[PDB]
Symmetry: C3
Subunit: 242 residues, 3 copies
């Protein structure tokens, strides 16, 4: 039965799943999970065939389901507000970044700023890559069978980054030399620079999100109690691997 | 009178119009027309000098003139809704894609998904190019004098794609070898990657749209009864063409 | 005291500030200031490490603090409106473009259109670069110590461009030959194509904006009475300069 052609059809499916990751036919993904004091979750899908590059502005990071200038002016300039509310309830408590598919985690950047998006003391001194944006080594490398994904979690806090904005970018891993934006390829990937624009959802709790979305879309994930929710494809190979 | 310099000035204008298509000085366009049960039309202009790449999210495809989480959760995960409305009235009935200007129709992709934008059974198995996205050969090639344009129509239906999202991309035709993203050109076109961002309008009926917009902007179009509405520039040439 | 190591630390800071402009580690910026009849200002930050490319649509250019189809249809097609309001109060009176950081002003384009974004008489005749979009030579070159920035101001008026849309793009100055989108570099900058998406603020008056934002973020600026508000870093060099 182990060598029945039907089983080998199953084998083909699972070899396909693992090889699809490295293939040019798959997407790379960054999912940004935002956790609010009300226990709800706002989720952003960032995705592209080869290169993810997105800004999540303040209005993208606050809770838009359990929900202005008087407050906004106070997070625009120092002491410039006219609001009796010091900190908006709907600003996120924590985040998790999940990088999955064929991401080269070494190319990831997660650059979290305050409301004005301006790093440092003034615009002409801003650095394109502040040290805290070089987050690659701080991701945790998770494995589920032959699948590999990466997580990075943290708190936004009660300071400037409690009114957050985020720039996120990552490249598809290239294990060989022909660049996915080499001149013979660039136009085909440039045509897909917006496949797909950032996409969001909201869920009342993490547990309900896991049942209705994480599991249904087979998105790799780690819960608050540190449980891996991810598909698992066991490795198939006819010969030893180094 | 046929060889009066004034007539030759007219000739210059019309030769200009036909040659402008192939020139680097023109835009390529994809117009997405969305037809609602109320007979109104929402229209998206997608445009770029060399490379169109856009996502039309669910909120871009529904009728925003004749117009949430309780319903949205039901199209996010299976059986996860809390809405007495099964299908929103404002979801589009049908679409037409019009590709015009110097498009290379062979490079077009029209990738229509459900609300979650995720092709296939799970994110790690999604294909960047599902077979139904390779729509080039299904477009109808329309001619109006020397002008050429392409149309593709269809129904969204009452299933997952009745809650649609769309990725659309196409390149400008290059009849020669110097790529419009060759290293000596790439930076100049990269600087125009967002000339222009997707732009929308709404019209109460197709007939009123044709008078007030299709004709006024000289946009090639085909009505519901299959009538071509397009400018016509008759071909001018001093010698036979193969 | 002039050669105390503490002073030389100050010298290092200021040499850093001037050299940071030309370094790959800085951003380029275009700020678009929009001035309304109510004396308020809406401000857009456009920014990127190497290449700015943005559309400011009509809803981005009108006053969204001191604030539809019946009017919108009238600026979509000629005489197609159903509004008793001829011109919306919230459309901007004037603009100023501030290009700063290491911009190559020779690559700037400021293309202002009417509501439909369509240059010329019809879409197939639109030019990607209308003459008025080649604004480089019309900018005023401002200096503040070793800093250089560029301003361009004007009125929107009471015609088509009184219902404005804008495409803006500019490249980082490259004083040498290795292109920032050369094949060996392109993927790293493509990954940052959306660092950062366009970002806006609003201020009740120019004077309050200058105190709470222009000065706080050290953004180069020129007020309505023609006063330069900009940081100043005096040039430091140990030898004569040509
Ligand atoms: N990384 C970093 N964060 C800073 C800095 N200065 C202030 N912060 C803010 O510090 C916050 C988190 O720091 P914590 O020390 O845990 O304080 P908190 O829980 O936010 O509450 P506060 O004491 O009010 O800051 C974030 O919201 C940041 O915006 C800084 O220099 N570097
Ligand atoms: N192309 C494609 N469409 C599918 C598939 N499964 C379901 N659909 C949906 O089928 C719908 C159109 O199919 P039809 O057979 O004409 O049915 P309908 O008019 O939408 O009404 P239903 O019978 O409820 O599906 C679209 O909304 C699709 O989302 C599939 O496997 N392939
Ligand atoms: N550059 C340019 N602007 C034009 C043209 N035709 C109309 N305009 C409009 O003219 C307006 C500014 O021109 P002005 O002569 O100062 O007139 P105005 O103050 O806007 O008031 P009007 O007399 O109603 O136009 C802008 O809003 C433009 O949209 C044109 O051919 N070229
Ligand atoms: Mg803090
Ligand atoms: Mg169906
Ligand atoms: Mg005018």
């Amino acid at each position: 039965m182990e060598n029945s052609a039907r089983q080998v059809a199953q084998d083909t499916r699972e070899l396909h799943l693992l090889q699809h990751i490295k293939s040019d036919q798959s997407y790379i993904y960054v999912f940004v999970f935002l956790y609010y004091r009300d226990h709800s979750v706002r989720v952003w899908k960032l995705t592209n065939p080869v290169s993810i590059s997105e800004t999540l502005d303040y209005d993208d990071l606050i809770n838009n389901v359990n929900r202005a200038i008087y407050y906004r002016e106070g997070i625009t300039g120092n002491d410039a507000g006219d609001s009796i509310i010091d900190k908006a309830y709907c600003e996120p408590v924590s985040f998790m970044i999940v990088a999955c598919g064929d991401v080269d985690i070494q190319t990831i950047e997660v650059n979290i700023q305050g409301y004005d998006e301006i790093e440092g003391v003034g615009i002409l001194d801003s650095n394109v890559t502040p040290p805290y944006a070089i987050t690659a080594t701080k991701f945790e490398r998770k494995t589920s069978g032959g699948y590999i994904f990466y997580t990075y979690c943290g708190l936004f806090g009660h300071g400037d980054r409690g009114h957050p904005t985020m720039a996120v970018g990552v490249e598809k891993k290239n294990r060989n030399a022909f660049g996915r934006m080499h001149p013979m390829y660039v136009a085909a990937n440039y045509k897909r620079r917006n496949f797909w624009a950032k996409k969001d959802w909201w869920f009342p709790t993490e547990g309900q999100m896991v049942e209705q979305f994480i599991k249904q879309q087979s998105i790799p994930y780690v819960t608050a109690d540190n449980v891996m929710i991810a598909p698992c494809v066991r490795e198939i190979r006819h010969h030893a691997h180094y």
